[PDB]
Specification:
The longest helix has 9 residues. β2 and β3 form a beta hairpin. The chain is an alpha+beta fold. It has one domain: Knottin, scorpion toxin-like (Defensin A-like, 2-Layer Sandwich). The protein has one helix and three strands; from the N terminus they run βαββ. The N and C termini lie far apart (about 30 Å). A three-stranded antiparallel β-sheet has the order 1-3-2, with helices on one face. This is Kurtoxin. It comes from Parabuthus transvaalicus. Keywords: Calcium channel impairing toxin, Disulfide bond, Ion channel impairing toxin, Neurotoxin, Secreted, Toxin, Voltage-gated calcium channel impairing toxin, Voltage-gated sodium channel impairing toxin. GO terms for molecular function: calcium channel regulator activity; sodium channel inhibitor activity; toxin activity.
């Protein structure tokens, strides 16, 4: 059970896709039921994912 800012795959989306629920569906895939993106500049923010969740991976748009 971990919480933080999960990204997509190459961090090409500033660690946050775009819409609010747009990150909840992907976060839910990582078991992060409560997953919402800050529509401002705080990247995505989901809680309830595994310790191996992919968040704060750093690295510029890898794609």
């Amino acid at each position: 059970k971990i919480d933080g800012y999960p990204v997509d795959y190459w961090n090409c989306k500033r660690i946050c896709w775009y819409n609010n629920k747009y990150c909840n569906d992907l976060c839910k895939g990582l078991k992060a039921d409560s997953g919402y993106c800050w529509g401002w500049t705080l990247s995505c923010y989901c809680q309830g994912l595994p310790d191996n969740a992919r968040i704060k991976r750093s690295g510029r748009c890898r794609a």
